[PDB]
Amino acid sequence: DTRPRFLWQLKFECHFFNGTERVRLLERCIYNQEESVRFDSDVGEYRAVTELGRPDAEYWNSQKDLLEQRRAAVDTYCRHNYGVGESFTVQRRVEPKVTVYPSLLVCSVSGFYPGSIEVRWFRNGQEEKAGVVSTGLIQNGDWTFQTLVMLETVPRSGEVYTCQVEHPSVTSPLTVEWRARSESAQSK
Amino acid sequence: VSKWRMATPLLMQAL
Amino acid sequence: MIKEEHVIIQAEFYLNPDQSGEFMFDFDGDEIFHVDMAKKETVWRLEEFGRFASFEAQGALANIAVDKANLEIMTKRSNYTPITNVPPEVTVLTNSPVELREPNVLICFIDKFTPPVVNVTWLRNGKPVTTGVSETVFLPREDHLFRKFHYLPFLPSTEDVYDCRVEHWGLDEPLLKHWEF
């Protein structure tokens, strides 16, 4: 199927800063991946982004009542939907599960929400920042995230490694210890 | 249960 | 770590000649819901979201008729200039660390592509499989490309290997991304 394609995308973007204290509304019109015309609540009217969108900015700016309602939409649309969704989006918290296994030592941190997280490696109580490689943050598409943080290390006998995770869902770090084989152990 | 709202795009000029 | 900003996006599209169109809301990269045009039904991404909110699906159908009308006008205004295909990136991951015989899910994450038409197949030991598969709608990106997820439930094995096979008009060849235990 090599028939030519023609695509039209519309986006209404509600940008929130400091709760609903600061709210900006964008309406963006995009043909074949290129934005042609845009309403920005900072400007209060349509503006062409490319020459292809000039006709539309002119025509839509002439419809004054609808333009008034679009200037009000920071309240009637953006703030409204934020209030409806807050409890299950803004305030969603799902605790990470932490698994440590050799592959390298891998600290797999899964199932968590929101995305901001800190994962740290310790060796015998001391933080190790060298030989660390991370996937970064991966969005799973189902309102959870994962990340894998690898430590390249020469695991000796007697060594004890700890993966530590801080995340807004917990008030104290999650830790998982992994130990190499014991060589010799003694009474004292 | 609270109602989610949508915004409606405008028609382009046809002539 | 606590988020300093949030973005809610209502993302719609119409595509010719396919006559495909979608309507969804995105919160910081996750789908809140979409309207299934054929079922005329609001589909919440996690079913519990619908305990807290409702959306009248008919409004999305009305919007998609405006989007189609405008697409027809833009197509001619551009002198029938077609979209440039941009092929996807693909990654395959499991949802959780794998444990033998414990139900898990393979995720095929398809990213950075346009137009929003893909053909995705799962293979097990080289053979197509479909039992229990699911997928998302086409999710938005800041560069106006798309994202999409496909999922395959499975029982992890030391012997079975899987591929996600992705076909798109911007690819010179179909792509495979494998996964094994």
Residue numbers in the entry:
A (entry chain B): 2 to 104, 114 to 198
B (entry chain C): 104 to 118
C (entry chain A): 0 to 180
Task: Reproduce the article's own wording on this structure.
Professional antigen-presenting cells express a subset of different alleles of heterodimeric MHCII proteins on their surface. The structural hallmarks of antigen binding by MHCII molecules are well understood at the phenomenological level: Optimal occupation of the four main pockets (P1, P4, P6, P9) in the MHCII-binding groove by peptide side-chains and concomitant formation of a conserved set of hydrogen bonds mainly between peptide backbone and MHCII side-chains are necessary and sufficient to guarantee high-affinity binding of certain epitopes and their subsequent surveillance by T cells. Initially, the class II-associated invariant chain peptide (CLIP) occupies the MHCII-binding groove, but can later be replaced in the endosomal compartments for higher affinity antigens.
In order to unravel the impact of conformational plasticity on peptide exchange, we first characterized a kinetically stable pMHCII as reference, an HLA-DR1/CLIP complex with the P1-methionine of the natural placeholder CLIP102–120 substituted for tryptophan (DR1/CLIP102–120M107W, shortened: DR1/CW). Indeed, the DR1/Cw complex is markedly more resistant to exchange against a fluorescein-labelled haemagglutinin (HA)-derived peptide than DR1 loaded with wild-type CLIP (DR1/C), as detected by an FP-based peptide-exchange assay. The results reveal that the N-terminal half (region coloured red in Fig. 1c) of the peptide-binding groove extending from the P1 to P6 pocket region, including residues αF48-L60 and βK65-Q92, displays strikingly little protection from HDX in DR1/Cw.
